Design a protein around this ligand. Structure first.
Ligand SMILES: OC[C@H]1O[C@H](O[C@H]2[C@H](O)[C@@H](O)[C@@H](O)O[C@@H]2CO)[C@H](O)[C@@H](O)[C@@H]1O
Length: 512
């Protein structure tokens, strides 16, 4: 047995390695803390084939997409163990009724300022530009933060009223997507104004900013608790405080809760359980990681009660209280691409903020209408009857793509019925992981091949043959998770092709 733990390079990995070394001394078992590049991207590729780490570490927002793929194993955390962590932290790691990952710590962006340069932090975002005038006079910069990640810019975009998905009575509504509304256009406009008014360069990354503030070159930065240790080490006189206001209202950061999930493919499930509950999630386990790089408002009540007495944590918690817990819906991986692209094209000057935000909002519309078209076809091909409920935006286009899918998709199923049958029988998809396995196989078979409407219809028709065969054994709960993945490989990995082919209109045009 062994334990391979993947965790982001910005988190305390040497501290976690000390926790695994402490576990190593009591079990023999080697714990290996690797911190790979583009972790949120690499984990899904490897763990789909069943080649990942035993324990994965990321903010909860990506775990809901991992669970739909079946890249995660369900955790069995005893009734007594759950009472040791905060109820809201367990809620962040709950997907479709099931706890999929372990809550570690609540993370939220706070404003970090140098007390020597600024005796006080500015109450508003609108007073940061004129501060730069008086700070440049002394050879300095007023504010520098990561402009590459939309996580760092979201609190300004969300302050006046921008949002990912609205929380309609215990659920997210993918029809109500506010990345285009006036509050987002106003927030992002102020950021673009700072680059137009030379107050900020539209190329500052995590390292540029961490160097600048910690060297004493910039007056304030934006960051999470993980960055505290490097400021502490730089000996800079700093204060962590509430984020400034935009247009009178607070900056609402997206609030992530660092989670610890176990690969479903992994053969060290019970080993990861003892490691996570009995070793890591204890005051001494979290104090070891926290000593390397601060976690934030930790899930563990025992250690959080102590940690609460730190005004840096109180600022973090007040900022978390003024922001929102990020959704864990599968669309989130795709949502972030759309939004990173928008923040990067607005700052880079490649686009107007109305355009950059539109192509981003449009990206969610392609995801919604696509999940609607695909799932409708697939569900009606198992029941044998149409759904009569409305579809919203681009309704007549989605209506025609369905009557186009029924004609062309049933032609593919008919003309290739002999072949589809052999493929479905040569797989023995009996249980849910076997079905989710297929989801990934067709996802990568289509992708590692040419992108055209022919192959799209083929991939969807096979999905409808599968939806018919799922129904046969009553475990037809995988139809929508299958329909949402075919949407993902399409609007996520082939976004540009679909947009170049005039969306679903080009498909209805294609076959006539
Ligand atoms: O910026 C988009 C990005 O935001 C979040 O990632 C944060 C993460 O939560 C922090 O712990 C830290 O690692 O910084 C990241 C931003 O660089 C989402 O979790 C992530 O999925 C998303 O792509």
């Amino acid at each position: 047995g062994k334990l391979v733990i993947w965790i982001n390079g910005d988190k305390g990995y040497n501290g976690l390695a000390e926790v695994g070394k402490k576990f190593e001394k009591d079990t023999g078992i080697k714990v290996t803390v690797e911190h790979p590049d583009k972790l949120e991207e690499k984990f899904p590729q490897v763990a789909a084939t069943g080649d990942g780490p035993d324990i994965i570490f990321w903010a909860h927002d990506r775990f809901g997409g991992y669970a739909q793929s079946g890249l995660l194993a369900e955790i069995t955390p005893d009734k007594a163990f759950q009472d040791k962590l905060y109820p809201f932290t367990w809620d962040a790691v709950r997907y479709n009724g099931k706890l999929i990952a372990y809550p570690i710590a609540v993370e939220a962006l706070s404003l970090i300022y140098n007390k020597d340069l600024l005796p006080n932090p500015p109450k508003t975002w609108e007073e940061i530009p004129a501060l730069d005038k008086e700070l440049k006079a002394k050879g300095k910069s007023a504010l520098m933060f990561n402009l590459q990640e939309p996580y760092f810019t979201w609190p300004l975009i969300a302050a006046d009223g921008g949002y990912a998905f609205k929380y309609e009575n215990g659920k997210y509504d993918i029809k109500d997507v506010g990345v285009d509304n006036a509050g987002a256009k106003a927030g992002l406009t102020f950021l673009v104004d700072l680059i137009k008014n030379k107050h900020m360069n539209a190329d500052t990354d995590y390292s540029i900013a961490e160097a600048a503030f910690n060297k004493g070159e910039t007056a304030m930065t934006i960051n999470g608790p993980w960055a505290w240790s490097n400021i502490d080490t730089s000996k800079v006189n700093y204060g962590v405080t509430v984020l400034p206001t935009f247009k009178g209202q607070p900056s609402k950061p997206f609030v992530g809760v660092l989670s610890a999930g176990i690969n479903a493919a992994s053969p060290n499930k019970e080993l990861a359980k003892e490691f996570l509950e009995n070793y890591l999630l204890t005051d001494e386990g979290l104090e070891a990681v926290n000593k390397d790089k601060p976690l934030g408002a930790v899930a563990l009540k025992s250690y959080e009660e102590e940690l609460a007495k730190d005004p840096r944590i109180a600022a973090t918690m007040e900022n978390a209280q003024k922001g929102e817990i990020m959704p864990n819906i599968p669309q989130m991986s795709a949502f972030w691409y759309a939004v990173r692209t928008a923040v990067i094209n607005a700052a880079s000057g490649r686009q107007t903020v109305d355009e950059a935000l539109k192509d981003a909002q449009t990206g969610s519309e392609l995801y919604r209408q696509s999940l609607e078209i695909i799932s409708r076809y697939l569900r009606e091909q198992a029941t044998g009857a149409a759904d009569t409920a409305p579809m919203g935006a681009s309704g007549a286009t989605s209506r025609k793509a369905l009557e186009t899918l029924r004609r062309v998709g049933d032609g593919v199923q008919r003309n290739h019925e002999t072949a589809f049958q052999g493929m479905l029988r040569k797989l023995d998809i009996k249980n849910e992981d076997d079905v989710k396995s297929l989801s990934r196989v067709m996802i990568h078979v289509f992708s590692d091949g040419v992108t055209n409407w022919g192959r799209i219809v083929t991939l969807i028709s096979f999905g409808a043959f599968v939806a018919k065969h799922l129904k046969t054994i009553n475990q037809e709960s995988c139809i929508e998770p299958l329909a949402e993945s075919i949407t993902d490989v399409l609007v996520r990995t082939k976004r540009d092709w679909l947009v170049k082919q005039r969306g679903w209109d080009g498909f209805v045009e294609f076959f006539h």
